[PDB]
Design a protein around this ligand. Structure first.
Ligand SMILES: O=C(c1csc([C@H]2CCCNC2)n1)N1CC[C@H](c2cccnc2)C1
Lengths: 39, 156
């Protein structure tokens, strides 16, 4: 069996670590929920 | 049992000791997580039982105790926060500007943040702390980095 355990509140926190680029990718979504890259 | 609002870790004892398989969001008495984490299986909360209510493999989403409740969405302009709950590590807010997943059925926001498989289910939040989607279903791009969609369900 699987079980759940609390990890924290859902709150916006100012002065957080800002990282990660913003790409525009042409993708596809299959019947099985898998995301594919279209080229 | 424990139904207090917030972010939760999804664990198991089927393998070596305790192992984090994913993350979920409790909201309005409904546990929202990604399908690939639980595969539809029931959960235990303290001495309680979380039995599935709605789930969909194409969307990769599953809600326990009730219907999907999270209904906010990225405005296509603002920066957002992945409240990422990593395995073995404490919850951590990471701010970023999401990109786009151009599909034949519409655009979807996407966070370019690489985290271990057990982080799947972690919420993406807007400036008001409103849940705009879950992290954990995406793709691997040309340079090898991982780009996950902002997966959001439908409120009924
Ligand atoms: O998006 C992920 C994922 C999240 S973090 C993660 C790993 C991958 C290696 C580096 N980053 C950590 N993998 N899935 C794709 C395969 C899998 C699935 C299968 C069927 C349907 N939906 C999803 C989960």
């Amino acid at each position: 069996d699987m079980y759940i355990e609390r990890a924290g509140d859902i709150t916006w926190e100012k002065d957080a670590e800002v990282t990660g680029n913003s790409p525009r990718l042409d993708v596809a979504l299959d019947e099985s929920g898998d995301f594919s890259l279209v080229e | 049992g424990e139904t207090t609002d917030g972010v939760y870790r999804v664990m198991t004892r089927r393998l070596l000791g305790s192992t984090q398989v994913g993350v979920g969001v409790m909201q309005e008495g409904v546990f929202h997580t990604m399908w690939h984490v639980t595969k539809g299986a029931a959960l235990r909360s303290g001495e309680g039982r979380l039995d599935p209510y709605w789930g969909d493999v194409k969307q990769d989403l599953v809600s326990y105790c009730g219907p999907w409740k999270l209904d906010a969405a990225w405005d296509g302009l603002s920066e957002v926060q992945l409240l990422a709950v990593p395995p073995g590590e404490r919850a951590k807010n990471i701010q970023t500007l999401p990109g786009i997943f151009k599909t034949k059925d519409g655009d979807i926001g996407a966070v370019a943040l690489d985290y271990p498989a057990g982080t799947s289910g972690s919420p993406i939040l807007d400036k008001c702390g409103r849940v705009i989607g879950l992290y954990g279903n995406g793709v691997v791009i040309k340079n090898g980095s991982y780009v996950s969609a902002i997966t959001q369900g439908k409120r009924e």
